[PDB]
């Protein structure tokens, strides 16, 4: 096959993507060894669904797992009656998700389980896939003539030919694995045929962070989680927290081999130590550096000019309310809280009005990084940690380092009951989630 592995693509046909997927334990070969994972569509990652605005998506999920499951259409501004975080599909049963892709939408999204208390083991075991909303902006020459690839960043650990079980420390920290994979492959080689690459990036890991840097090159950020930026933004590195997406242009500068690496990053994971005075918690410190892929440039590379503009970001109406959501931790109990409470599916925590804009101040009073995710209602990050955000784009996950406050502009879209939660999914399962009702 092609030197660079990527998930198989299923495209809408005539305005309709109608597809039956099964969530099933699947024997397969991965990173050179046989293992049984939990997959959608018999593959890890699951198939990439490629659609365009106004398409109808009709996805029937058949649950062939021994436990109940559901889907979260991560990042899609669709009704929470469809993207239903409280629905349960029992083993052996099926459910059809049907929605229309919104007209003003573009980017890389993804799908994965969201059954409270079971997310971390199901996601860790392999249940995820990407969804791409293609845009008319893809036709501008500076993008159309680039070589496009999806990079699904997701780690794994195997024990006895199956995903490794969660330990108590895994529930506290979020589980990371030793196999640090791209598109389910171990350190693949991308032999570029064009000098400009357009890379769609997805962090589909439970908890691992990717401090991305390409040797000898900057990256040009062109999209965040849920839409394009207004113009390309040059960065020397790009941190992708769990659940986040980005799109970058790479302008290969000379012939050669260049490593794409996940550089050392300390997200605050904790270990234990006994030095003669009772066991005490001690920081794990930064992650070890990882090579994600080998990028081979073509001969005599002459990259395309960058696009001068992408998509204007909407001018939002003045907000009508400010909310303050404080994140805290009880590490030794592996319990995690929002405004001092754990999730209760019967309890509505916030009540807002559709078509108004809110300011959300999310404050991390813990010591770990927490990537905060809101379903249904994409937001504009105004500032994090006292620093203004350097671009305007739609996001749906925002990473908070210890002590940091993020200020978000949240337009409320579809009416109904939805959730917000930490996207270290172990923390969600262990309580760090709340309920928003929009009326
Ligand atoms: Cu998600
Ligand atoms: Cu968290
Ligand atoms: Cu969620």
Task: Tell how far CA 101 is from the center of its chain.
Answer: 19
Which token pair is 107?
A: 């980017």
User: What ligand is nearest to the CA atom of residue 205?
Assistant: 1
Q: Is 170 helix (H, G, I), strand (E, B) or coil?
A: helix
Cα maximum dimension of the chain: 69
Distance 419 CA to ligand 3 centre (A): 7
Give every CB contact of residue 333 below 8 A, 6+ residues apart in sequence: none
Residue 234: Cβ within 10 Å count: 10
Residues less than 5 Å from ion ligand 1, measured at CB:
74, 243
Which token pair is 294?
A: 């080998």
- 1-134 maps to which CATH number? 2.60.40.420
- Give 24's Cβ-side CA count (13 Å radius): 13
Facing residues of 234 across strands? Answer: 220
Q: Is 428 helix (H, G, I), strand (E, B) or coil?
A: helix
Which token pair is 417?
A: 């009951």
1-134 and 312-439 have identical folds = yes
- 312-439 maps to which CATH number? 2.60.40.420
Q: Which residues are annotated as a binding site?
A: 72, 74, 112, 114, 280, 370, 373, 375, 421-423, 427
Contact 208, 289 (CB under 8 A): no
Terminal alpha carbon distance of the chain: 51
Contact 184, 215 (CB under 8 A): no
Distance 216 CA to ligand 3 centre (A): 36
Distance 436 CA to ligand 1 centre (A): 16
Q: Which residues are annotated as a binding site for Cu(2+)?
A: 72, 74, 112, 114, 280, 370, 373, 375, 421-423, 427
Method of structure determination: X-ray
Q: Is 410 helix (H, G, I), strand (E, B) or coil?
A: strand
Strand positions, DSSP E, 115-256: 129-133, 147-156, 158-159, 162-163, 179-182, 185-186, 189-191, 196-203, 210-214, 219-224, 227-235, 238-240, 245-251
- 135-311 maps to which CATH number? 2.60.40.420
Contact 282, 271 (CB under 8 A): yes
- The residue assigned the tokens 């640090």 is 180
- Would you mind telling me the total number of residues written for the chain in this entry? 439
The span from the CA of 113 to the CA of 21, in Å, is: 13
Instruction: Give the residue among 113, 151, 115 at the shortest CA–CA distance from 7.
Output: 151
Map out the domains of the chain as residue ranges.
1-134, 135-311, 312-439
The span from the CA of 30 to the CA of 43, in Å, is: 10
Contact 133, 105 (CB under 8 A): yes
The span from the CA of 302 to the CA of 299, in Å, is: 9
Instruction: Give the residue among 346, 176, 373, 203 at the shortest CA–CA distance from 270.
Output: 176
Phi first, then psi, for residue 280 (nearest 5°) are: -140, 150
Residues less than 5 Å from ion ligand 2, measured at CB:
370, 422, 424, 427
Contact 152, 112 (CB under 8 A): no
User: What ligand is nearest to the CA atom of residue 337?
Assistant: 2
């Amino acid at each position: 096959g092609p030197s660079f592995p990527e998930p198989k693509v299923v495209r809408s046909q005539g305005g309709l993507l109608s597809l039956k997927l099964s969530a099933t334990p699947t024997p397969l070969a991965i990173a050179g060894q046989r293992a049984t994972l939990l997959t959608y569509g018999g593959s890890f990652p699951g198939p990439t669904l490629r659609v365009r605005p106004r398409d109808t998506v009709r996805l029937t999920l058949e649950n062939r797992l021994p436990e109940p499951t559901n889907l979260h259409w991560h990042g899609l501004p669709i009704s929470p009656k469809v993207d239903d975080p409280f629905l349960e599909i029992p083993p052996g049963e099926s459910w059809t998700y049907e929605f229309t892709v919104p007209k003003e939408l573009a980017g890389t999204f993804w799908y994965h389980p969201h059954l409270h208390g079971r997310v971390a083991p199901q996601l860790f075991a392999g249940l995820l896939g990407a969804l791409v909303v293609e845009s008319s902006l893809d036709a501008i020459p500076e993008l159309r003539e680039a070589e496009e690839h999806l990079l699904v960043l997701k780690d794994l650990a195997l024990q006895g030919g199956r995903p490794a079980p969660h330990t108590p420390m895994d529930w506290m920290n979020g589980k990371e694995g030793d196999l640090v994979l791209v598109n389910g492959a171990l350190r693949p080689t991308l032999v570029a045929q064009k000098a400009t690459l357009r890379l769609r990036l997805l962090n589909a890991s439970n908890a691992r962070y990717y401090r991305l840097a390409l040797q000898d090159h900057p990256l040009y950020l062109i999209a965040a989680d849920g839409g394009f930026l207004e113009e390309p933004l040059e960065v020397s590195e790009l941190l992708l927290a769990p659940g986040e997406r980005a799109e970058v242009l790479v302008r290969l500068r000379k012939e050669g081999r260049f490593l794409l690496q996940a550089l050392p990053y300390d997200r605050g994971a904790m270990g234990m130590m006994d030095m003669g005075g009772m066991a005490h918690a001690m920081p794990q410190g930064p992650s070890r550096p990882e090579t994600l892929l080998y990028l081979i440039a073509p001969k005599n590379p002459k990259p395309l000019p960058l696009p001068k503009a992408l998509s204007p970001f909407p001018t939002l109406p003045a907000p009508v309310v400010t909310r303050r959501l404080v994140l805290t931790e009880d590490m030794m109990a592996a319990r995690f809280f929002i405004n001092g409470q754990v999730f209760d599916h019967r309890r509505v925590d916030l009540k807002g009005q559709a078509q108004t804009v809110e300011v959300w101040e999310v404050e991390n009073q813990g010591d770990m990084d927490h990537p905060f995710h809101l379903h249904v209602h994409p937001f504009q990050v105004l500032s994090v940690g006292g620093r203004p955000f350097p671009y305007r784009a739609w996001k749906d996950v925002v990473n908070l380092k210890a002590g940091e406050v993020a200020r978000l502009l949240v337009p409320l879209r579809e009416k109904g009951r939805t959730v917000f939660h930490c996207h270290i999914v172990e923390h969600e399962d262990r309580g760090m989630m709340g309920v928003l009702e929009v009326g």
